[PDB]
C-alpha cells in the first residue's frame, strides 16, 4: 500500500516543513528520488491508525514521547546506524529514542518551552507566577495583558502543574503516577484562579496566543523555539528567558526530542535511512530546517556547537535542565489525552480541579490497573493459586476489583462452560500466533451491543477459560499476552465509559453485596 521509489514524510505544521522540503529537493537532485513533505492535522493520532494497516508515510517526525507506543504496536523499523554515525549525536538524544534496548528513531533536536516576553512592554520579566496577577492589573490599565499561551494542549500548562511536585511517571515506574497529587492540584488551581480573576481566557489556543503576542497585545507567552520565526517577522522586541517559579520552585517543562521514525511497512527503509543520516542530520540539513523554524538544541554535535552561543538556545537548555525528558513508554498517549481533558474542564469550570485531576489519574492508570486485575485473574484461574506479590500502596482498588471479579466471575464461567468450550473448539488456540487472532474476534464482539460491567466480566471470564486451556497444553507463557490483548480490547473500545464509571472503583461499587 506504501509506494516504492518515493519518500513521503510527515512533520507537524508548527515545524520547518519548507526547510525539510529543500532537504528533500537536494536528496532528489543527487538520487532521482522525489521527497514529498506533508504536515497533516493530528498526525500523531493518524500515524498509528494508518501505519497499523501497512499505510502512512515512510518517515514520521514527532517528539520521542509517542515513539514507544508506535514501536510496541510494531509500526517502526528498528534503526541501526553504525558507531561512527552514533558518535555524531549527543548520547542523551539517543537515550530519548531507545525502547526495549532498540533505537526506534533518529533524534533531531531538543525542545523545551521558555518564557517569551516583549522587552518594550516588560523590560524585567517576572521571576514568579505569583506576581503575574498584579502585573496583569498594571498592564490592563495600559490596554495590554500580562500572559497568553495555548490552554488547549497540556504541554503548555505542564511546567506549572509539575513545578510543586506534579509528575507523569516516577523514575520509569508505571505504578507511580503523579497527576492528582497536592503539587499538581496547587499548579492547576493557580491556573484556574488566573482564568477566574480574568487574567487569562479558557478559550485561548495556539493561534490566539501567538497573534496576541506578535501584535504586541500581551507582554508574555509560553512557547518553543519553532515560534521564534513568526516573532522575528512581527518586529516585536522579544527575549527568551527562564520560566517563572511557582511556590519558590522552578517550572518543569516536559522536554521533547524531535525524532524521525521509519514506518515498519515502508518498502523504502534504505532510502529513508540514507536521507535521515546523510542529508538531514548534517550541518547543511539541520540549517535548512532551522532557517525556516528554529529546531532548538540540535542532536548533531557539530551544528549544536554553533547554535549554543545564541542566548535563546541557552534559555531553552536552562528550562530543559529544570524540566524532565518525557518518557517514551506506550502509556504516554493515554496520559496526554487524560491531562488535556482535565486542563480544559478545569479551565472552563465543567469540573473542579480535584474532579478533573482525579479523572486524569484514573485515565493515566487505566491500562496498567486493568492489566494487573485481568492478568492476576487469568493466571490464578489457570494454575489454581493466587499471585502472592503485593499490589503496592495505591492498589486497594486492584485487590477489591480482583475479589469482586472472583465472586462474580465464578458464576459466569460455571453457567457458560458449554458455550465457552464450543467457542474455544471453534477457534484453534494452541500458541502465541492464535492469541493475536483472538483480539479481532473480541474487538468484533465488543463493537456491537450495550456497554455494562456484566459484558466485561463475560470477556474476562472467557479469557480465564482460555488461560486454563493454555496451561493444560503447556502454553502457560501465552497467558500474559492473552491478558495484554483482553486489556487492549477493553481500554481501546471503552476508555471513556470506564473513566465515567470511576474505572474499577465503579466495578466494585456496581456488584457490591
Ligand atoms: C470470543 C468469544 C466471546 S468474548 C465475549 N465477551 C463478552 N461477551 C461475549 N458474548 C456475550 C453474548 C453471549 C452470552 C452467553 C453465551 C454466548 C454469548 C455478549 O456479547 O454479551 C463474548 C464472546 C462470545 C460471543 C458469542 C458467542 C460466544 N460463545 C462463547 C463466547 C461467546
Ligand atoms: O499537549 C500534549 C502534547 O505535548 C507534546 O506535543 C508538543 C510537541 O512535543 C512539540 O513539538 C510542539 O509541537 O507542540 C506540541 C504540543 O501541542 C507531546 O510531544 C505530544 O505527544 C502531546 O500530545
Ligand atoms: Na497538534
UniProtKB/Swiss-Prot annotation:
It is found in: Periplasm. InterPro entries: Maltose/Cyclodextrin-bd (IPR006060), SBP (IPR006059), SBP_1_CS (IPR006061). One of its GO terms (cellular component) is outer membrane-bounded periplasmic space. It comes from the Bacteria. Keywords: Periplasm, Signal, Sugar transport, Transport. The complex is composed of two ATP-binding proteins (MalK), two transmembrane proteins (MalG and MalF) and a solute-binding protein (MalE). Belongs to the bacterial solute-binding protein 1 family. Part of the ABC transporter complex MalEFGK involved in maltose/maltodextrin import. Binds maltose and higher maltodextrins. This is Maltose/maltodextrin-binding periplasmic protein. It comes from Escherichia coli O157:H7. The gene is malE.
Amino acid at each position: 500500500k506504501i509506494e516504492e521509489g518515493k519518500l513521503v514524510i510527515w512533520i507537524n505544521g508548527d515545524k520547518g516543513y519548507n526547510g525539510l522540503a529543500e532537504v528533500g529537493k537536494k536528496f532528489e537532485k543527487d538520487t532521482g528520488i522525489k521527497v514529498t513533505v506533508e504536515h497533516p492535522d493530528k498526525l500523531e493520532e493518524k500515524f498509528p491508525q494508518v501505519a497499523a494497516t501497512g499505510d502512512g508515510p515512510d518517515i514520521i517526525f514527532w517528539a520521542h514521547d509517542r515513539f514507544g507506543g508506535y514501536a510496541q504496536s510494531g509500526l517502526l523499523a528498528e534503526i541501526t546506524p553504525d558507531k561512527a554515525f552514533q558518535d555524531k549525536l549527543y548520547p542523551f538524544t539517543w537515550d530519548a529514542v531507545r525502547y526495549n534496548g532498540k533505537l526506534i528513531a533518529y533524534p533531531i533536536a531538543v525542545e523545551a518551552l521558555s518564557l517569551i516576553y516583549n522587552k518594550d512592554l516588560l523590560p524585567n520579566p517576572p521571576k514568579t507566577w505569583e506576581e503575574i496577577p498584579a502585573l496583569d492589573k498594571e498592564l490592563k490599565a495600559k490596554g495590554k495583558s500580562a500572559l497568553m499561551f495555548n490552554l488547549q494542549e497540556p504541554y503548555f500548562t505542564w511546567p506549572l502543574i509539575a513545578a510543586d511536585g506534579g509528575y507523569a511517571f516516577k523514575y520509569y515506574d508505571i505504578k507511580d503516577v503523579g497527576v492528582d497529587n497536592a503539587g499538581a492540584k496547587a499548579g492547576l488551581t493557580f491556573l484556574v484562579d488566573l482564568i477566574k480573576n480574568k487574567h487569562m481566557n479558557a478559550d485561548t489556543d495556539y493561534s490566539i496566543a501567538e497573534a496576541a503576542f506578535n501584535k504586541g497585545e500581551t507582554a508574555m507567552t509560553i512557547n518553543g523555539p519553532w515560534a521564534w520565526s513568526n516573532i522575528d517577522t512581527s518586529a516585536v522586541n522579544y527575549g527568551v528567558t527562564v520560566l517563572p517559579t511557582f511556590k519558590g520552585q522552578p517550572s518543569k517543562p516536559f522536554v521533547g526530542v524531535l525524532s524521525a521514525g521509519i514506518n515498519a511497512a515502508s518498502p523504502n527503509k534504505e532510502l529513508a535511512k540514507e536521507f535521515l543520516e546523510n542529508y538531514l542530520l548534517t550541518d547543511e540539513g539541520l540549517e535548512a530546517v532551522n532557517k525556516d523554524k528554529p529546531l532548538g538544541a540540535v542532536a548533531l554535535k557539530s551544528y549544536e556547537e554553533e547554535l549554543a552561543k545564541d542566548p535563546r538556545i541557552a534559555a531553552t537548555m536552562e528550562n530543559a535542565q529544570k524540566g524532565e525528558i518525557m518518557p517514551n513508554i506506550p502509556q504516554m498517549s493515554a496520559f496526554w489525552y487524560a491531562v488535556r481533558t482535565a486542563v480544559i474542564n478545569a479551565a472552563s469550570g465543567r469540573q473542579t480541579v480535584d474532579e478533573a485531576l482525579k479523572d486524569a489519574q484514573t485515565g493515566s492508570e487505566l491500562y496498567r490497573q486493568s492489566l494487573e486485575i485481568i492478568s492476576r485473574y487469568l493466571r490464578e484461574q489457570a494454575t489454581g493459586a493466587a499471585d502472592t506479590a503485593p499490589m503496592g500502596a495505591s492498589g486497594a482498588t486492584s485487590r477489591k476489583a480482583l475479589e469482586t471479579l472472583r465472586r462474580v466471575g465464578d458464576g459466569v464461567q460455571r453457567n457458560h462452560e458449554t458455550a465457552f468450550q464450543g467457542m474455544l473448539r471453534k477457534l484453534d488456540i494452541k500458541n502465541e500466533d492464535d492469541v493475536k487472532s483472538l483480539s479481532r474476534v473480541m474487538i468484533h464482539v465488543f463493537s456491537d451491543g450495550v456497554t455494562n460491567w456484566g459484558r466485561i466480566v463475560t470477556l474476562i471470564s472467557f479469557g480465564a477459560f482460555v488461560a486454563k486451556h493454555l496451561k493444560t497444553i503447556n502454553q502457560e507463557s501465552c497467558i500474559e499476552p492473552l491478558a495484554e490483548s483482553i486489556t487492549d480490547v477493553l481500554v481501546r473500545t471503552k476508555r471513556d465509559w470506564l473513566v465515567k464509571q470511576r474505572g474499577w472503583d465503579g466495578f466494585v461499587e456496581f456488584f457490591h453485596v
